[PDB]
Write a protein that binds this ligand. Structure first.
Ligand SMILES: [Cl-]
Ligand SMILES: [Cl-]
Ligand SMILES: [Cl-]
Ligand SMILES: [Cl-]
Ligand SMILES: [Cl-]
Ligand SMILES: [Cl-]
Ligand SMILES: [Cl-]
Ligand SMILES: [Cl-]
Ligand code: NA
Length: 129
């Protein structure tokens, strides 16, 4: 599924991401925009042989199991394929663990490079929330 901006914002809010660990909803929407372009099916192979999965590009080295990332953990206890669902519950549940891991949203390199410090509230502008 390719979410609409305000559509994803509403789903993230429903699922308890707005202000989770202090990060406003615009931060999460901005991260999803630059990680996956709002596409739940997005996958991206990393140079280390791990893969990033779903609307928040959660990575198989630590967070999910794909059976093909040697030495990796599965700290969210989910198959990475669960992160590709039209329903964002698994991705949100796992994002909450990630953002609680110590470095906040700096875990998402596209957040740090493209969202952090910007006017992130623009991403939820005009949304009925
Ligand atoms: Cl957009
Ligand atoms: Cl915001
Ligand atoms: Cl593996
Ligand atoms: Cl493969
Ligand atoms: Cl594990
Ligand atoms: Cl699995
Ligand atoms: Cl959803
Ligand atoms: Cl933080
Ligand atoms: Na893994």
């Amino acid at each position: 599924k390719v979410f609409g901006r305000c559509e994803l914002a509403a789903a993230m809010k429903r699922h308890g991401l707005d202000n989770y660990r202090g990060y406003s909803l615009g931060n999460w929407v901005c991260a999803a925009k630059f990680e996956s372009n709002f596409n739940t099916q997005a996958t991206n192979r990393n140079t280390d042989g791990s893969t990033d999965y779903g609307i928040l590009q959660i990575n198989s080295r630590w967070w999910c199991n794909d059976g093909r990332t040697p030495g990796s953990r599965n700290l969210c206890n989910i198959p990475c394929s669960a992160l590709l669902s039209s329903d964002i519950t698994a991705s949100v549940n796992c994002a909450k663990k990630i953002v609680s891991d110590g470095n906040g949203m700096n875990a998402w390199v596209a957040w740090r490079n493209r969202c952090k410090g910007t006017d992130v509230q623009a991403w939820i502008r005009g949304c009925r929330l």
